From a paper:
pmcAmyloid formation of α-synuclein (α-syn) is a pathological feature of Parkinson’s disease (PD), multiple-system atrophy (MSA), and dementia with Lewy bodies. An abundant presynaptic protein, α-syn is 140 amino acids in length with a putative biological function in aiding the exocytosis of synaptic vesicles, in which the first 89 N-terminal residues fold into a helical structure upon membrane association. In its disease-associated, aggregated amyloid state, residues 37 through 97 adopt β-sheet structure, which overlaps with the lipid-binding domain. Notably, both N- and C-terminal α-syn truncations are associated with PD.
Out of the three ∆N-constructs studied, 41‒140 fibrils had the most homogenous population, and thus, the fibril structure of 41‒140 was successfully determined by cryo-EM at near-atomic resolution. Interestingly, the density map of cryo-EM three-dimensional (3D) reconstruction shows two asymmetrical protofilaments intertwining into a left-handed helix with the helical twist of −1.64° with a half pitch ∼52 nm, similar to our negative-stain TEM. The fibril structure was determined at an overall resolution of 3.2 Å, with clear side-chain density that permitted unambiguous de novo atomic model building. A different number of residues was resolved for the two asymmetric protofilaments, comprising residues E46‒K96 and E61‒D98 for chains A and B, respectively. Chain A folds into a β-strand–rich architecture including the β-arch kernel (E57–T72) that is present in other full-length α-syn structures. Chain B adopts a dramatically different β-hairpin conformation. Unlike chain A, the lack of density for N-terminal residues G41–K60 suggests conformational flexibility in this region for this protomer. The β-arch motif in chain A is stabilized by a previously documented intramolecular salt bridge between K58 and E61 (24, 31, 37, 38) and hydrogen-bonding between H50 and E83. An intermolecular salt bridge is formed by K80 in chain A and E83 in chain B, an interaction not observed in other structures. Additional hydrogen-bonding is found between the two Q62 residues. This interface has a calculated buried surface area of 442 Å2 with an estimated total binding energy of −7.87 kcal/mol which is nearly twice of that of the steric zipper between residues H50 and E57 in the full-length protein (239 Å2 and −4.49 kcal/mol).
Residue numbers in the entry:
A (entry chain E), B (entry chain G), C (entry chain D), D (entry chain C), E (entry chain B), F (entry chain A): 46 to 96
G (entry chain L): 67 to 95
H (entry chain K), I (entry chain J), J (entry chain I), K (entry chain H), L (entry chain F): 61 to 98
């Protein structure tokens, strides 16, 4: 049935070289954030700088 | 059935070298953020700078 | 049945070298955030800087 | 039946090396954050800087 | 039946080496955060900096 | 039947090496934070910095 | 070969579904 | 066969900031002060 | 067969920072003070 | 068959910091003070 | 067959902090002061 | 078959900390000052 409303991601990390010798690095494998609804309902959101 | 509303992604990371010497870098494998709806409903969102 | 509303992610870490000498590093495997509803309901959320 | 509303993640750690001499490193396998409702309910959540 | 509302996570640790000599390291396997309701219920959660 | 609302996580540790001489290390497997209500009830939780 | 940098500010960020503001400046004399 | 040889690697005074944010907000502000009088 | 060779690796005065945030907020601010009088 | 060779690895004075936050908030502020008179 | 070879590994004056937070709040503030007169 | 080879491994003055928080709050602040006059 695969994926209906969500998303699908596949990855294979065979060989990677990362040398951190002069700074800072951040890396990641597929972080996700999800807001979904099926029927009657309401998702109200304010994400960011709101003040 | 594959994908109905969301998207699909495949990425095989075979061989990669990144050299961090004169600064900083960020990268990752396909982060995603999703909002979808099936029937009657509402997603009311404001993302960014709102003030 | 796969995934209906959520998302699907697969990753394989075969060989990876990270050498952290000239600074700091952060990395992760698929952290997730999820808010969903099925029927008549309400998720109301404000995430970030609200003031 | 797989997963209905939540998300699905699989990872395999075959071989990974992290050496950290001149800084700090944080890493992890799939931390999760989830809020969900089924029927007549409500989730109200302000996460971040609220003031 | 798999998982209905929660999430699914599988990870295998074949071979990994963390060598940390001149800094601090933190790592872990799948810490989770969850708040869910089924029927007539409510969750109100302010997390972060609230003041 | 798996898990209805809770989450599912499996992990195997074949071989992992940690060495720490001049810093701090913390390692963990499946730390849990959960709150769940099914019928008539509620949960109010403010966690973090409240002042 | 040489890799000699005088003095540097370096900024990198990725944001998905939010907002981010970078503000950097260097002082060299 | 992928190889990298860093010969000198001499960077004197640096500020380096990286961040990743999903579903939120993050603002970063950095500044360097360098003076090589001689 | 991948190989990294770092010859010198000399970085004198540095501040470095990375962070990841999912479903929240995070602001970092850094600054360096360097003076090489000689 | 991957290999790392760090020849010198000399980083005089640094501050470094990383963090991951899921479902919360985290703000950091760092700064270095360096003076190499010579 | 992966191997790490650190030749020099010299970091004179450093401070480093890392944290992970799930469902909470955490703020860190670090600083260094180094003076190598010679 | 992975091996660890640390040749020099010299850290003069350091201060490092790490923490993990699940369902709570945790904030630390640390700093170092080193003076290598010579």
């Amino acid at each position: 049935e695969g994926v209906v409303h969500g998303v699908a991601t596949v990855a294979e990390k065979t060989k990677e070289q990362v040398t951190n010798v002069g700074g800072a690095v951040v890396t990641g494998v597929t972080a996700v954030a999800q807001k979904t609804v099926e029927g009657a309902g309401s998702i109200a959101a304010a994400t960011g700088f709101v003040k």
